[PDB]
Design a protein around this ligand. Structure first.
Ligand code: ZN
Ligand code: ZN
Ligand code: ZN
Lengths: 44, 49, 48, 49, 49, 49, 64, 242
């Protein structure tokens, strides 16, 4: 569960219960990291 | 020339570059079907589900 | 089929539950229809 | 008037050009959901049921 | 043509009159009670916002 | 203003992302004068109310 | 946003000509002269570079 | 309720809004599920509570928690005799404390129309009535706001946070209110760093008399260096401070 800060782009593991916030930046906009699962694209 | 047969078309076709636009209206955004769907509880009549 | 006395509302009918249903909102909090609220007012005054 | 499929304000598009990205576009739909704690009894949270 | 400014100025006077009316009402209650009133508390900030 | 109450400049993108209103605080200098029919006048000014 | 790989009309490769095309223009070539230097004879392919807008350049001005 | 399958868990279907036997296919209930609606796919106090919260700009969720607390204590009525503005201020303080962004009573009396004494009285009364509790305030709670109300940088803010946390750790300030320790630590980190602030401004912001800032600054005055962050830039030597 890695969230990327919108300000400094820091990857920080955030639990569901704890508040959503950059650990060092303090920014309050967080983006989920891209899924590790593999998705196939046909180059069509 | 005709693509299917390769024969010259008798009329000469006006052809050249023109600026075209794709509009927001797509058919997928519009196609929709209803067949024994989720009626309303109060009115007992069709509604979106 | 009709009498002048019948025009006076001596006994008030109560619409079925189908006519006025119990809507569900914000979970299990049953949202009574407007008719039920008026019916609740009617019965309260009627009992009083 | 190639094959009658452009009649009445219709258009015949090149499939090969479409295959090459001709008028290809992206559609972005954004969905917003907020969790509200209003009401002591009810407290909605984000988690997979 | 009423642009954003003049349109906004139309709202502000109505909303500012309510603000001035509100402080008059708030102050009148305390003055009649015999106690001076706090200006910060008399102003309702939500009226303009 | 954050939950803790710490003010911070609001960028237009953050307002767009967090569904905020791009609003600027408004302050007014208020001068209050009180007369108590005792040949004394007290004039107190609340700067930036 | 970025130069298409193929000309839409004929499928000729165009994705390796945008940088050369910009270089030729910097060399004081006229737009038509640059296209001829790049081997774009059919006006369908000349259309590809003559009408291209390279938005990917400004999209890179935003930090990831 | 499949007639063939007594006690069968019918599966809800969104195609038509009907419940089907999990292993028969028989549709029990024609279109009864109501798919669209189901799956997403006293006063003058709430006015007063919002009036107060706007003066502090605290977010609406705190105001919702405040209104919930007010409704609850207006049902208990174990403090019916108290003024409604007093109950509102105490609820606002309890909500601010519960959310984890606590303010001081002086930061609620500054907004409400009642004295801090009544706020504290009704606060204790409400905690007694609701049979709830609130976690004890720490010094790191008043720092994101005190250092931001002051024009201090984020560096000085984390500095004062570290100083105060270590000072309450090392027992330099026994039994003194966290707000005074916070003000003292902020004064230390401010006089040490580039932007200096006097005792007066910090007293105004924190709501602490400058005498208390002095008293709890002399308690952390001798242990200044080992409280500061190790990696800390400044333009006034931490070895010389008033
Ligand atoms: Zn960050
Ligand atoms: Zn071509
Ligand atoms: Zn069955």
């Amino acid at each position: 569960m890695i969230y990327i800060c919108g300000e400094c782009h820091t990857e920080n593991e955030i639990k569901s219960r704890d508040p959503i916030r950059c650990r060092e930046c303090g920014y309050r906009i967080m983006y989920k990291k891209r899924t590790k699962r593999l998705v196939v694209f046909d180059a069509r | 020339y005709n693509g299917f047969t390769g024969r010259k078309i008798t009329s000469q076709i006006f052809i050249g570059p023109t600026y075209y636009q794709r509009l927001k209206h797509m058919v997928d955004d519009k196609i929709h079907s209803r067949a024994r769907g989720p009626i309303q509880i109060l009115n007992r009549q069709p509604m979106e589900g | 089929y009709a009498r002048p006395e019948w025009m006076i509302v001596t006994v008030l009918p109560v619409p079925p539950l189908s006519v006025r249903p119990a809507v569900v909102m914000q979970g299990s909090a049953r949202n009574q229809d407007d008719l039920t609220h008026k019916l609740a007012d009617i019965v309260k005054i009627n009992n009083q | 008037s190639y094959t009658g499929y452009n009649q009445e304000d219709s258009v015949i598009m090149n499939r090969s050009a479409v295959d090459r990205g001709f008028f290809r576009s992206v559609f972005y739909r954004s969905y917003k959901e907020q969790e509200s704690k209003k009401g002591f009894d009810q407290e909605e949270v984000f988690e997979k049921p | 043509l009423d642009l954003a400014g003049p349109l906004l100025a139309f709202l502000f006077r109505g909303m500012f009159k309510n603000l001035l009316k509100e402080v008059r009402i708030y102050a009148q209650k305390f003055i009649d009670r015999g106690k001076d009133f706090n200006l910060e508390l008399a102003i309702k900030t939500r009226i303009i916002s | 203003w954050e939950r803790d109450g710490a003010p911070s400049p609001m960028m237009p993108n953050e307002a767009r992302l967090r569904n905020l209103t791009y609003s600027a605080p408004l302050y007014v200098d208020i001068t209050k004068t009180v007369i108590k029919e005792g040949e004394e006048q007290l004039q107190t000014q609340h700067q930036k109310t | 946003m970025i130069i298409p790989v193929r000309c839409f009309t004929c499928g000729k490769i165009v994705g390796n000509k945008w940088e050369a095309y910009l270089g030729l223009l910097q060399a004081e070539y006229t737009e038509g002269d640059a296209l001829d230097a790049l081997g774009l004879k059919r006006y369908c392919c000349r259309r590809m570079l003559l009408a291209h807008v390279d938005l990917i350049e400004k999209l890179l001005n935003y930090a990831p | 309720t499949c007639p063939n399958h007594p006690d069968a868990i019918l599966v809800e279907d969104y195609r038509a809004g009907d419940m089907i036997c999990p292993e028969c296919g028989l549709v029990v209930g024609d279109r009864v599920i109501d798919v669209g609606s189901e799956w997403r796919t006293m006063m003058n106090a709430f006015k007063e509570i919002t009036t107060m919260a706007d003066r502090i700009n605290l977010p609406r969720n705190i105001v919702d928690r405040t209104n919930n607390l007010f409704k609850q204590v207006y049902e208990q009525k174990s403090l019916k005799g108290r003024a409604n503005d007093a109950i509102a201020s105490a609820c606002l303080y309890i909500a601010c404390r519960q959310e984890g962004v606590p303010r001081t009573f002086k930061e609620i009396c500054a907004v409400s129309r009642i004295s801090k004494k009544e706020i504290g009285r009704c606060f204790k009364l409400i905690l007694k009535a609701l049979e709830t509790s609130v976690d004890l305030i720490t010094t790191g709670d008043f720092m994101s706001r005190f250092c931001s109300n002051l024009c201090l940088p984020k560096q000085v803010q984390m500095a004062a946070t570290h100083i105060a946390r270590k000072a309450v750790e090392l027992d330099l300030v026994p039994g003194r209110s966290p707000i005074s320790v916070a003000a003292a630590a902020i004064y230390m980190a401010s006089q040490a760093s580039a932007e200096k602030r006097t005792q007066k401004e910090i007293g105004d912001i924190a709501g602490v008399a400058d005498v208390t800032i002095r008293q709890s600054y002399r308690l952390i005055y001798p242990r200044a260096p080992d409280l500061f962050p190790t990696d800390f830039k400044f333009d006034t030597p931490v070895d010389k401070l008033p």
